[PDB]
């Protein structure tokens, strides 16, 4: 009956899930930052 | 593909313990709390 | 430079569809990665160059001054065609034509020798491999 | 990668980086301490026998 029940529902293995989650979505957000600006006149280096 | 947008810098090491090599201790584990 | 836009990569070929309107791509970053040449009609895809981490195997130094360098994640056929100079951030270029070449999942290490027996572990190197100064 | 993240691909950028003194290799020092810290966690766990 343990085999059955691992597999039945998605929120099985949810305290595995989100620490694998955790790791990628702050990465995501480390990348997106470097759109901004910090009140400068523009975010791309090499134009300013 | 976003694995592949990480051009500024963000890569990932991979493990000491290779998946194949933890399933080696815990199958000891699982015939020396049998026998 | 492409107009202004100054930069650094290798440019290749896309098949991206550019509508009449519109000259600059752009990701995720907001940072252009395909331009159009401004003399034909063609499109170009930008990607930086190869780049990556360097890693120093060593005993101590009393014990010997001999070592071994490990390339990160690296396919092992990539280093020798950058041997020249003016082309490598580090100059002592000589090693990576040293002692051969062995491919482990975290690049290839180049300066140490693979045996087949088993031994415990002395300097881990990653993926189930480890280095140790033997006879 | 700090020298890279920020001032990437500019020349001129990672000279002035250099007058920050020693940001990039605190970082570069704080994260190895997690890195060599995860292999213990399983060498702990799995590595009982
Ligand atoms: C040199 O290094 C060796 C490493 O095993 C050590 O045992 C020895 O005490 C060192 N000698 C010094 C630091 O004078
Ligand atoms: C390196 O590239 C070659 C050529 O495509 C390929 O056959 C080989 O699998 C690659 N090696 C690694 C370690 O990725
Ligand atoms: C291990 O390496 C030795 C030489 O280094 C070789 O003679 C032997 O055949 C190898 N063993 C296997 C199983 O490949």
Redesign the interface.
């Known amino acids: 009956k343990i085999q059955d029940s691992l597999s039945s529902t998605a929120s099985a293995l949810g305290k595995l899930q989100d620490v694998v989650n955790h790791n990628a979505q702050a990465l995501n957000t480390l990348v997106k930052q470097l759109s901004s600006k910090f009140g400068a006149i523009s975010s791309v280096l090499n134009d300013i | 593909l976003?694995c592949a947008?990480?051009?500024?810098?963000?890569?990932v090491?991979?493990?000491?313990?290779?998946d194949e090599?933890?399933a080696q201790?815990?199958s000891?584990?699982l015939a020396?709390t049998i026998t | 430079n492409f107009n202004g836009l100054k930069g650094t990569g290798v440019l290749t070929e896309s098949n991206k569809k550019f509508l009449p309107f519109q000259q600059f791509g752009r990701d995720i970053a907001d940072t252009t990665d395909a331009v159009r040449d401004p003399q034909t009609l063609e499109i170009l895809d930008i990607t930086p160059c190869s780049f990556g981490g360097v890693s120093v195997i060593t005993p101590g130094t009393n014990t010997s001054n001999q070592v071994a360098v490990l390339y990160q994640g690296v396919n092992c056929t990539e280093v020798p065609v950058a041997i020249h100079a003016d082309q490598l951030t580090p100059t002592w270029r000589v090693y990576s034509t040293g002692s051969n070449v062995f491919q482990t999942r975290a690049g290839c290490l180049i300066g140490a020798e693979y045996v087949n027996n088993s031994y415990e572990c002395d300097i881990p190197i990653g993926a189930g491999i480890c280095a140790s100064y033997q006879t | 990668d700090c020298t890279m993240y920020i001032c990437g691909d500019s020349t001129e950028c990672s000279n002035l980086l250099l007058q920050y003194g020693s940001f990039c290799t605190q970082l570069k020092r704080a994260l190895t301490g997690i890195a060599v810290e995860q292999d213990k966690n399983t060498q702990e766990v799995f590595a009982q026998v």
């Open positions: 976003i947008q990480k051009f500024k810098g963000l890569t090491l991979p493990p000491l313990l290779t090599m933890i201790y815990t000891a584990l020396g």
